[PDB]
């Protein structure tokens, strides 16, 4: 009864040609970045909440789907009652976030416009999901990253802050202006402990370096033969990718184990910036062991462990296990080239478990390269750009073909 009330986009009357579908994205991408400035009416932008409330409710409803609290059906009816329900959770969660974003610290006017801002993107999202190759929830995570990257990398704000400088006062300080004056005498930059802080441009090439190693691991996958039933030798493949889990929920856990740990020390005072946080979170000192070795030992292993642990649990929930994939295939009538159905479980199972974890253990160490590097992205979500980048180009090739 609720799914009928809310709006959906018409499935296009026929096929659409790529020149049009590409020009639909000039529209939505123009409109998102038009939305990512204009400040709300507090006498700050329109895109304050973003798609993250819809994504996270997506994850909450996917874990309710996966934990078997609410039943999931590959049949279109149980999906037809669920695909609207998910969008409804996406509709409520942006109202919930309209309250939650404001409450922590004029109001109702602002909540209406944050609600409208979250609402508009939910449709702009579905537009791309029918009249374009790829969705949108995705697209925005590119859009609001590569811009911030190139602004913070080759825009003029070295003048102030951590971001470039190496000057004790104002002076002349733009990313390119120092590349004209550092060429004359010493760069000052070599393999050593260094003055620390300094600028960011030198970091920048590191940020390109983890970019250029991420791409390598975005290739990495295992292939399992898949010939459907009822079709002589038509060789479809199924990829188990090294990363898997898209390693999205693992870093969310990495944030959550920081959010539960750092509040429960403030809960204990009512019934420590030093002791408790001095063993958990990193030193953010450029060097390896530095002055304090114990800060360096506890931070790493625990993160790579707790990231992995959460990966291996994720799979037990959001389908993507041994047992579930099989179902998923069995539905669409697919099989291993020479096996009885059941055996599938076994023959691919020995690929999933390892992956689920080993991805995590490769992403924990990649947060470590990003933190130790102090890279310009300063995070794991450089990955996220390239994942999507790959996906987009592949469409450009599909539509080229």
């Amino acid at each position: 009864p609720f799914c009928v009330i809310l709006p959906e986009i018409q499935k296009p009357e026929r096929k659409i040609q790529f020149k049009e579908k590409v020009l639909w994205t000039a529209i939505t991408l123009f409109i998102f970045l038009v939305c990512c400035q204009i400040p709300l009416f507090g006498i700050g932008t329109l895109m304050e909440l973003g798609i993250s409330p819809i994504v996270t409710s997506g994850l909450i409803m996917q874990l309710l789907a996966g934990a078997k609290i609410i039943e999931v059906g590959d049949t279109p009816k149980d999906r037809a009652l669920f695909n609207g329900a998910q969008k409804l959770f996406g509709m409520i969660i942006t109202i919930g976030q309209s309250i939650v974003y404001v409450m922590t610290g004029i109001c109702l006017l602002i909540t209406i416009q944050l609600f409208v801002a979250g609402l508009i993107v939910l449709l702009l999202d579905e537009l791309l999901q029918k009249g374009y190759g790829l969705g949108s929830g995705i697209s925005l995570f590119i859009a609001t990253n590569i811009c911030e990257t190139i602004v913070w990398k080759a825009f003029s704000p070295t003048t102030v802050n951590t971001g470039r400088g190496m000057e004790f006062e104002g002076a002349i300080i733009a990313l390119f202006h120092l590349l004209a004056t550092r060429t004359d005498k010493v760069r000052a930059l070599r393999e050593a402990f260094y003055r620390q802080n300094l600028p960011n441009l030198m970091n920048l090439i590191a940020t390109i370096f983890v970019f250029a190693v991420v791409i390598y691991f975005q290739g990495f996958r295992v292939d399992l033969p898949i010939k459907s039933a009822r079709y002589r030798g038509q060789y479809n493949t199924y990829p188990i990718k090294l990363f898997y889990t898209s390693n999205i929920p693992i870093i969310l856990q990495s944030a959550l184990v920081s959010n539960l740990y750092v509040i429960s020390q403030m809960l204990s005072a009512r019934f420590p910036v030093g002791g408790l946080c001095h063993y958990l979170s990193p030193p953010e000192s450029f060097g390896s062991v530095l002055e304090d070795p114990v800060h360096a030992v506890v931070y790493i292993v625990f993160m790579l462990g707790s990231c992995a642990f959460f990966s291996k649990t994720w799979i037990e929930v959001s389908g993507s296990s041994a047992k579930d994939v099989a179902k998923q295939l069995k539905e669409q009538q697919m099989v291993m080239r020479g096996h009885r159905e059941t055996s599938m479980v076994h023959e691919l199972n020995r690929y999933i478990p390892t992956a689920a974890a080993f991805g995590g253990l490769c992403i924990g160490a990649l947060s470590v390269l990003a933190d130790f590097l102090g890279a310009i992205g300063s995070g794991t979500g450089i990955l996220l750009a390239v994942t999507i980048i790959y996906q987009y180009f592949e469409i450009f090739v599909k539509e080229q073909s």
Partner: peptide, 19 residues
């Protein structure tokens, strides 16, 4: 399944630490 309920209970705080 206890460890799975703790995962959902963790995930719930993600929505509480958006702020």
């Amino acid at each position: 399944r206890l460890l799975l309920l703790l995962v959902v209970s963790n995930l719930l705080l993600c929505q509480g630490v958006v702020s």
